[PDB]
C-alpha cells in the first residue's frame, strides 16, 4: 500500500514550468512557491518569462498541483494524488471555451529531489483573435467552485469534468468547460477513490516590486463529499 501522503506532512517547495502556444502565440511561464497540504494551501508567484502573456492569467490557473489538497482524515483512503508520489501522475486536460477556442494540456506532477515539480505543455487552438481570451477581456479573479472526482477504473486513475465561469469585464460570463484525466507514472499501488469533490478558493494579486508580467496566487483546495457515517 502507498505511503506517499507522508511526503506532504510539512511545507514542500514547488516549481512550475509551462511552455505554451495559443494560435501560434508562444509563451513560457515559470512559478515558484510552496505547498502546505495539512492546510490545503498553495502560495506561488508566476512570471511570464517571454515577456507579455498573450492570454489572461485567470485562464491558466487550473493548469498551473492537486497533491496539496487537504483530505480530511476520514477521506485519506480517497487521495489518489498523493498515493502516486513520489513517482507522480500525468494530468491531461481539454479546456473548451464556449464560442471560442480550446486548450489541450499535458503535465507531469512529480518529485524532483525535494521539490514538487509541475511541468506543463499547453497548446491552444481555434481562438478568436479579438475574443475574450486573446482580446484580454476577463477580470483578474477566479470564483470559488466545486469539482467532482470519479475513479477511472479502466485507466487506473481518476477523471473529472467541471465548469469555470470566468468573469468578463462587461459583466457577462465566459464559460471554460474542463475535461480532466489523471494516471500514474510509476507502477506502484494507487488509491481509486469513491465519488467525491474538491472545493477550491483563489486569491489573485500583484507583487508591488515586480516589473514583469506576473501573477501572485494563493489557493486553497479541500476534499469533501464522502459521508461521515458510524465511525
TrEMBL record:
It holds the Pfam family GFP. Keywords: Chromophore, Luminescence, Photoprotein. It comes from the Eukaryota. One of its GO terms (biological process) is generation of precursor metabolites and energy. Transmembrane segments: none annotated. InterPro entries: GFP (IPR009017), GFP-related (IPR011584), Green_fluorescent_prot (IPR000786). Signal peptide: none annotated. Belongs to the GFP family. This is Green fluorescent protein. The gene is gfp.
